[PDB]
Amino acid sequence: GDDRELAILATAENLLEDRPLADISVDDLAKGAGISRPTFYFYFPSKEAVLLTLLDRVVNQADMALQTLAENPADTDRENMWRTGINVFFETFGSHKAVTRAGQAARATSVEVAELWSTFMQKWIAYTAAVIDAERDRGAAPRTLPAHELATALNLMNERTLFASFAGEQPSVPEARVLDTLVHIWVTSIYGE
Template sequence: MTTAGQTRALRGRRAIRPSGDDREQAILATAERLLEERGFGAISVDDLAKGAGLSRPTFYFYFKSKEAVVLSLLEPVIARADSEFDGAIQRLPADPRRVWRNGIKAFFTAFASNRALARAATEALASSSELRSVWSDYMQKWIDQTTAMIIAERARGAAPETIAAADLATSLNQMNERTMMAALSAATPAVDQDRVVDTLTHIWVASIYGESG
């Protein structure tokens, strides 16, 4: 016969078994640790599962691929980078340079806080169509936001009508991506990390507010 105390004990043992959230977090923590030690291409699903104390089939219950793990790690980083653009178009008239700089700084700081992840994302973009598709969606969102802000500045007479706003926004955002990732991955050549934000801000402000040549 099972006593009440034994029942409580059994419940207690069940309660401390890893939950689904715990297992998912274990996989993510393993990925972060391994990315500090080696490149994305050198990490396998087996490495992630073993490091999290799980079987390979259990891993696939939570993530469909190692690229999906990187995407999950990227989500909060991108959210931090994105936060500075909330309401930015309304703040532009007060101090345009500060608004552009804050947006660029937020993006760079978010990715600089996890350089290993930034390097992994750059590496994975070259080989993963899944990651490229998601990243492309984010890039398009940032380009659209920038386009709207440039159009607003032109409409209030603060910026001149030069090249198409969408073309300018696309070029500036793609420049940001390449310049930041080169700096964070210690590529050669690259802008020094301490000068990335000011360098990019200068180019953005000069491109948006400068007269056509």
């Protein structure tokens, strides 16, 4: 049952590594999953729904990793605290580059994809802002910008910069440099007066 669902998802993720969603047919997904086209439609109403499910899995993987980190703070300096958190997104989305790029494209055409991305970005920004606020309350960070506005810009920077790096866009930060680049900008803007 879900084995055929997982087979469809794995086929789609593998096919997206070499071609975009518009060049993959339902017949391609069914054939790769070892089922017929009508059997595919039992599990998913469309190839777009397959991508939505793939992206939901990736974003919830990142969310759960961040939740785990929040409950188990690593015992290091403040810079490496932010690095460990940004690295959740670097590693999670960087391990699913094809789904990440396909999902970014689908945001312009899928209301469900756009709402999924917006929901989680709001959650992650609210968490960033709450950590900034806690740092200000304990006297470690200065009260400069409104924390939620700062958190919004830093999270949008990460979205755009990580995704440019993973896609090899021109221009982009090399993937092997992008974590250090983002960590520098986060730490200086959160703690700088």
